[PDB]
DNA sequence: AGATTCGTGTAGCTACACGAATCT
DNA sequence: AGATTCGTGTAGCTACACGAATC
Protein backbone atom coordinates (compact mmCIF):
# COMPACT_ATOMS: atom_id res chain seq x y z
CA UNK A 1 0.00 0.00 0.00
CA UNK A 2 2.62 2.53 1.12
CA UNK A 3 5.26 3.67 -1.37
CA UNK A 4 7.93 4.45 1.22
CA UNK A 5 7.40 1.16 3.04
CA UNK A 6 7.37 -1.19 0.05
CA UNK A 7 10.45 0.48 -1.44
CA UNK A 8 12.44 0.62 1.79
CA UNK A 9 11.56 -3.00 2.51
CA UNK A 10 12.63 -4.16 -0.95
CA UNK A 11 15.83 -2.18 -0.49
CA UNK A 12 16.40 -4.02 2.79
CA UNK A 13 16.05 -7.43 1.19
CA UNK A 14 18.16 -6.42 -1.80
CA UNK A 15 20.80 -4.96 0.50
CA UNK A 16 21.00 -8.29 2.31
CA UNK A 17 21.29 -10.23 -0.95
CA UNK A 18 23.96 -7.96 -2.42
CA UNK A 19 25.93 -7.88 0.83
CA UNK A 20 26.02 -11.68 1.04
CA UNK A 21 27.02 -11.83 -2.62
CA UNK A 22 29.90 -9.37 -2.17
CA UNK A 23 31.03 -11.07 1.05
CA UNK A 24 34.39 -12.42 -0.21
CA UNK A 25 35.45 -8.93 -1.35
CA UNK A 26 34.61 -7.66 2.13
CA UNK A 27 32.49 -4.88 0.64
CA UNK A 28 29.00 -3.63 1.41
CA UNK A 29 26.51 -2.78 -1.34
CA UNK A 30 26.69 0.94 -0.52
CA UNK A 31 30.49 1.01 -0.57
CA UNK A 32 30.50 -0.83 -3.89
CA UNK A 33 28.01 1.64 -5.38
CA UNK A 34 30.16 4.56 -4.26
CA UNK A 35 33.34 2.96 -5.62
CA UNK A 36 31.80 2.42 -9.05
CA UNK A 37 30.58 6.02 -9.19
CA UNK A 38 34.06 7.30 -8.38
CA UNK A 39 35.43 4.84 -10.94
CA UNK A 40 33.36 6.45 -13.72
CA UNK A 41 35.37 9.68 -13.54
CA UNK A 42 33.87 17.38 -5.00
CA UNK A 43 32.08 15.90 -2.00
CA UNK A 44 28.67 17.59 -2.23
CA UNK A 45 28.77 16.83 -5.94
CA UNK A 46 29.51 13.17 -5.17
CA UNK A 47 26.81 12.97 -2.49
CA UNK A 48 24.27 14.29 -4.99
CA UNK A 49 25.17 11.69 -7.61
CA UNK A 50 25.22 8.97 -4.97
CA UNK A 51 21.86 10.01 -3.56
CA UNK A 52 22.69 10.55 0.10
CA UNK A 53 22.93 13.61 2.32
CA UNK A 54 26.30 15.25 2.98
CA UNK A 55 27.04 13.97 6.47
CA UNK A 56 26.13 10.43 5.46
CA UNK A 57 28.77 10.50 2.71
CA UNK A 58 31.26 11.96 5.20
CA UNK A 59 30.99 9.14 7.73
CA UNK A 60 30.76 6.56 4.94
CA UNK A 61 34.06 7.72 3.45
CA UNK A 62 35.93 7.71 6.77
CA UNK A 63 34.99 4.04 7.06
CA UNK A 64 36.46 3.51 3.59
CA UNK A 65 39.49 5.71 4.20
CA UNK A 66 40.21 3.65 7.31
CA UNK A 67 39.98 0.51 5.18
CA UNK A 68 42.22 2.22 2.62
CA UNK A 69 39.67 2.10 -0.19
CA UNK A 70 39.69 5.79 -1.06
CA UNK A 71 41.89 8.79 -0.29
CA UNK A 72 40.91 12.41 0.27
CA UNK A 73 42.95 15.32 -1.04
CA UNK A 74 42.34 18.88 0.08
CA UNK A 75 40.65 20.88 -2.66
CA UNK A 76 42.20 23.81 -4.51
CA UNK A 77 39.92 25.74 -2.18
CA UNK A 78 40.47 24.95 1.50
CA UNK A 79 36.67 24.60 1.73
CA UNK A 80 36.30 21.60 -0.56
CA UNK A 81 37.69 18.06 -0.48
CA UNK A 82 38.56 15.89 -3.50
CA UNK A 83 38.26 12.10 -3.64
CA UNK A 84 40.50 9.49 -5.27
CA UNK A 85 40.51 5.70 -5.39
CA UNK A 86 43.48 3.90 -3.87
CA UNK A 87 45.07 0.78 -5.34
CA UNK A 88 43.43 -1.33 -2.64
CA UNK A 89 40.12 0.24 -3.62
CA UNK A 90 40.45 -0.41 -7.35
CA UNK A 91 41.56 -3.97 -6.66
CA UNK A 92 38.62 -4.47 -4.32
CA UNK A 93 36.20 -3.07 -6.89
CA UNK A 94 37.63 -5.37 -9.53
CA UNK A 95 37.23 -8.30 -7.14
CA UNK A 96 33.61 -7.44 -6.40
CA UNK A 97 32.62 -6.64 -9.99
CA UNK A 98 32.15 -10.25 -11.12
CA UNK A 99 30.31 -11.03 -7.87
CA UNK A 100 27.85 -8.25 -8.61
CA UNK A 101 26.99 -9.71 -12.02
CA UNK A 102 26.28 -13.09 -10.41
CA UNK A 103 23.62 -11.52 -8.20
CA UNK A 104 22.54 -8.73 -10.56
CA UNK A 105 21.62 -11.42 -13.09
CA UNK A 106 19.34 -13.38 -10.75
CA UNK A 107 17.15 -10.58 -9.38
CA UNK A 108 16.97 -8.94 -12.80
CA UNK A 109 15.97 -12.24 -14.42
CA UNK A 110 12.82 -12.81 -12.37
CA UNK A 111 10.62 -10.08 -13.87
CA UNK A 112 8.48 -9.44 -16.93
CA UNK A 113 10.88 -6.61 -17.66
CA UNK A 114 13.67 -4.99 -15.63
CA UNK A 115 14.28 -1.75 -17.59
CA UNK A 116 10.65 -0.73 -17.05
CA UNK A 117 10.76 -1.51 -13.33
CA UNK A 118 14.10 0.30 -13.09
CA UNK A 119 12.90 3.60 -14.56
CA UNK A 120 9.75 3.46 -12.44
CA UNK A 121 11.77 3.32 -9.24
CA UNK A 122 14.17 6.03 -10.42
CA UNK A 123 11.44 8.52 -11.31
CA UNK A 124 9.62 7.67 -8.07
CA UNK A 125 12.77 8.59 -6.17
CA UNK A 126 13.07 11.87 -8.06
CA UNK A 127 9.37 12.39 -7.37
CA UNK A 128 10.07 12.28 -3.63
CA UNK A 129 12.85 14.85 -4.01
CA UNK A 130 10.31 17.37 -5.31
CA UNK A 131 8.99 17.86 -1.77
CA UNK A 132 11.91 20.26 -1.23
CA UNK A 133 10.68 23.81 -0.50
CA UNK B 1 22.62 0.45 -13.29
CA UNK B 2 22.52 -1.72 -10.16
CA UNK B 3 19.19 -2.92 -8.78
CA UNK B 4 20.25 -1.92 -5.28
CA UNK B 5 21.37 1.59 -6.28
CA UNK B 6 18.01 2.38 -7.84
CA UNK B 7 16.02 0.78 -5.01
CA UNK B 8 18.05 2.10 -2.06
CA UNK B 9 18.64 5.63 -3.36
CA UNK B 10 14.93 5.95 -4.09
CA UNK B 11 14.02 4.61 -0.65
CA UNK B 12 16.48 7.08 0.92
CA UNK B 13 14.80 10.04 -0.77
CA UNK B 14 11.41 8.50 -0.03
CA UNK B 15 12.22 7.89 3.62
CA UNK B 16 13.61 11.41 3.88
CA UNK B 17 10.44 12.99 2.50
CA UNK B 18 8.17 10.84 4.66
CA UNK B 19 10.09 11.75 7.82
CA UNK B 20 10.02 15.44 6.89
CA UNK B 21 6.24 15.15 6.61
CA UNK B 22 5.59 12.99 9.69
CA UNK B 23 7.54 15.43 11.90
CA UNK B 24 4.51 16.92 13.71
CA UNK B 25 3.50 13.40 14.79
CA UNK B 26 7.06 12.86 16.02
CA UNK B 27 7.28 9.60 14.08
CA UNK B 28 9.69 8.19 11.54
CA UNK B 29 8.51 6.11 8.59
CA UNK B 30 9.80 2.85 10.09
CA UNK B 31 8.08 3.56 13.40
CA UNK B 32 4.90 4.38 11.48
CA UNK B 33 4.87 1.22 9.39
CA UNK B 34 5.49 -0.91 12.49
CA UNK B 35 2.65 0.75 14.41
CA UNK B 36 0.30 0.39 11.44
CA UNK B 37 1.06 -3.33 11.19
CA UNK B 38 0.57 -3.82 14.93
CA UNK B 39 -2.66 -1.80 14.83
CA UNK B 40 -4.06 -3.83 11.94
CA UNK B 41 -3.19 -6.98 13.87
CA UNK B 42 -5.22 -6.78 17.08
CA UNK B 43 -5.86 -9.80 19.27
CA UNK B 44 -4.82 -13.41 18.67
CA UNK B 45 0.43 -14.34 16.36
CA UNK B 46 2.22 -11.14 17.41
CA UNK B 47 5.81 -12.30 17.96
CA UNK B 48 9.33 -11.03 17.31
CA UNK B 49 9.70 -13.45 14.40
CA UNK B 50 6.33 -12.75 12.75
CA UNK B 51 6.43 -8.95 12.90
CA UNK B 52 9.98 -9.13 11.56
CA UNK B 53 8.78 -11.34 8.71
CA UNK B 54 5.70 -9.21 8.07
CA UNK B 55 7.43 -5.82 8.10
CA UNK B 56 10.27 -7.34 6.09
CA UNK B 57 13.05 -6.69 8.58
CA UNK B 58 15.47 -8.93 10.46
CA UNK B 59 14.17 -9.57 13.97
CA UNK B 60 17.20 -8.06 15.74
CA UNK B 61 16.65 -4.79 13.92
CA UNK B 62 13.04 -4.80 15.06
CA UNK B 63 14.34 -5.66 18.53
CA UNK B 64 16.31 -2.42 18.64
CA UNK B 65 13.57 -0.49 16.83
CA UNK B 66 10.91 -1.52 19.32
CA UNK B 67 13.14 -0.53 22.24
CA UNK B 68 13.26 2.99 20.81
CA UNK B 69 9.45 2.91 20.66
CA UNK B 70 9.00 1.34 24.10
CA UNK B 71 11.19 4.20 25.32
CA UNK B 72 8.70 6.63 23.79
CA UNK B 73 5.97 4.59 25.49
CA UNK B 74 4.33 3.68 22.20
CA UNK B 75 4.55 -0.09 22.62
CA UNK B 76 4.72 -2.78 25.30
CA UNK B 77 6.31 -6.22 25.30
CA UNK B 78 4.85 -9.23 27.11
CA UNK B 79 5.79 -12.89 27.45
CA UNK B 80 3.68 -15.33 25.45
CA UNK B 81 7.75 -16.01 22.97
CA UNK B 82 6.94 -12.29 23.18
CA UNK B 83 3.74 -10.32 22.52
CA UNK B 84 3.69 -6.70 21.35
CA UNK B 85 0.86 -4.23 22.02
CA UNK B 86 0.24 -0.57 21.22
CA UNK B 87 -0.30 1.84 24.10
CA UNK B 88 -2.98 4.51 24.37
CA UNK B 89 -0.25 6.83 23.10
CA UNK B 90 0.32 4.31 20.31
CA UNK B 91 -2.97 4.77 18.48
CA UNK B 92 -2.95 8.39 19.66
CA UNK B 93 0.06 9.19 17.48
CA UNK B 94 -0.79 6.64 14.78
CA UNK B 95 -4.25 8.07 14.11
CA UNK B 96 -2.54 11.45 14.34
CA UNK B 97 -0.15 10.33 11.60
CA UNK B 98 -2.65 8.96 9.04
CA UNK B 99 -3.57 12.32 7.48
CA UNK B 100 0.10 13.36 7.37
CA UNK B 101 0.84 10.11 5.55
CA UNK B 102 -1.99 10.32 2.99
CA UNK B 103 -0.73 13.81 2.24
CA UNK B 104 2.65 12.73 0.90
CA UNK B 105 1.25 9.63 -0.84
CA UNK B 106 -0.90 11.80 -3.10
CA UNK B 107 2.08 14.09 -3.68
CA UNK B 108 4.56 11.39 -4.68
CA UNK B 109 2.46 8.58 -6.19
CA UNK B 110 0.90 11.05 -8.63
CA UNK B 111 1.35 2.58 -9.48
CA UNK B 112 -0.17 -0.60 -8.02
CA UNK B 113 1.33 -2.04 -11.20
CA UNK B 114 4.68 -0.77 -9.93
CA UNK B 115 4.13 -1.89 -6.32
CA UNK B 116 3.50 -5.41 -7.62
CA UNK B 117 6.84 -5.36 -9.45
CA UNK B 118 8.82 -3.68 -6.67
CA UNK B 119 7.47 -6.29 -4.25
CA UNK B 120 8.36 -8.99 -6.79
CA UNK B 121 11.90 -7.64 -6.98
CA UNK B 122 12.38 -7.43 -3.22
CA UNK B 123 11.07 -10.98 -2.98
CA UNK B 124 13.36 -12.01 -5.83
CA UNK B 125 16.40 -11.03 -3.76
CA UNK B 126 15.20 -12.68 -0.55
CA UNK B 127 14.91 -15.83 -2.66
CA UNK B 128 18.68 -15.72 -3.03
C1' DA C 1 17.81 -33.76 24.19
C1' DG C 2 17.35 -31.34 20.43
C1' DA C 3 14.76 -27.60 18.70
C1' DT C 4 12.54 -22.87 19.41
C1' DT C 5 12.43 -17.82 20.38
C1' DC C 6 15.08 -14.36 21.24
C1' DG C 7 18.73 -10.49 22.96
C1' DT C 8 23.76 -8.51 23.02
C1' DG C 9 28.03 -7.29 21.09
C1' DT C 10 30.02 -5.32 17.28
C1' DA C 11 29.74 -2.60 13.03
C1' DG C 12 27.87 -0.09 9.32
C1' DC C 13 24.13 3.18 7.04
C1' DT C 14 21.21 7.43 7.53
C1' DA C 15 20.10 12.34 8.25
C1' DC C 16 19.19 16.96 11.12
C1' DA C 17 20.77 20.85 13.66
C1' DC C 18 24.37 23.84 14.47
C1' DG C 19 28.09 25.68 13.26
C1' DA C 20 33.45 26.59 11.60
C1' DA C 21 36.03 27.54 8.14
C1' DT C 22 36.84 29.59 3.92
C1' DC C 23 36.22 32.10 -0.56
C1' DT C 24 34.37 36.54 -3.77
C1' DA D 1 29.26 41.62 3.95
C1' DG D 2 27.48 37.79 1.98
C1' DA D 3 27.88 33.46 -0.03
C1' DT D 4 30.22 28.58 -0.19
C1' DT D 5 32.15 23.79 1.47
C1' DC D 6 32.37 21.03 4.81
C1' DG D 7 32.50 18.42 9.96
C1' DT D 8 30.43 17.08 14.82
C1' DG D 9 27.08 16.06 18.07
C1' DT D 10 23.08 13.68 18.41
C1' DA D 11 20.03 10.03 17.30
C1' DG D 12 17.89 6.66 14.70
C1' DC D 13 17.84 2.30 11.33
C1' DT D 14 20.18 -2.11 9.71
C1' DA D 15 21.94 -6.65 10.51
C1' DC D 16 25.51 -10.73 11.10
C1' DA D 17 27.69 -14.10 14.64
C1' DC D 18 27.08 -16.03 18.71
C1' DG D 19 24.92 -17.64 22.65
C1' DA D 20 20.97 -17.45 26.45
C1' DA D 21 16.99 -18.93 27.80
C1' DT D 22 13.24 -21.69 27.08
C1' DC D 23 10.05 -26.02 25.46
Query: How would you name the oligomeric state of the polypeptide chains in this document?
Result: homodimer
Largest sheet of chain A: 2 strands, antiparallel
User: In the residues of chain A, how many domains can be counted?
Assistant: 1
State the end-to-end CA separation of chain A. Answer: 26 Å
User: What letter string, H or E per element, gives the SSE order of chain A?
Assistant: HHHHEEHH
The total count of strands of chain A amounts to 2
> Order of strands in the sheet with the most strands of chain A?
1-2
Fill in the CATH topology of chain A. Answer: Arc Repressor Mutant, subunit A
Level-2 CATH architecture of chain A = Orthogonal Bundle
Largest interface: A-B, 52 and 48 residues
What Rg of chain A, in angstroms, do the CA atoms define?
Answer: 16 Å
Amount of helix of chain A: 55-70%
Domain HTH marR-type (chain B): 1-128
GO biological process, one term (chain B): response to stress
Organism (chain B): Mycobacterium tuberculosis (strain CDC 1551 / Oshkosh)
GO molecular function, one term (chain B): DNA-binding transcription factor activity
Which features characterize this protein?
homodimer; DNA-binding; 133 residues; two-stranded antiparallel sheet; 6 helices; Arc Repressor Mutant, subunit A; 2 strands; mainly alpha; 8% strand; WH-like_DNA-bd_sf (chain B)
Fold and architecture overview:
The structure is a homodimer. Chain A is mainly alpha-helical and 133 residues long. Chain A has one domain: Arc Repressor Mutant, subunit A (Orthogonal Bundle), CATH 1.10.10.10. Chain A is built from six helices and two strands; from the N terminus they run ααααββαα.
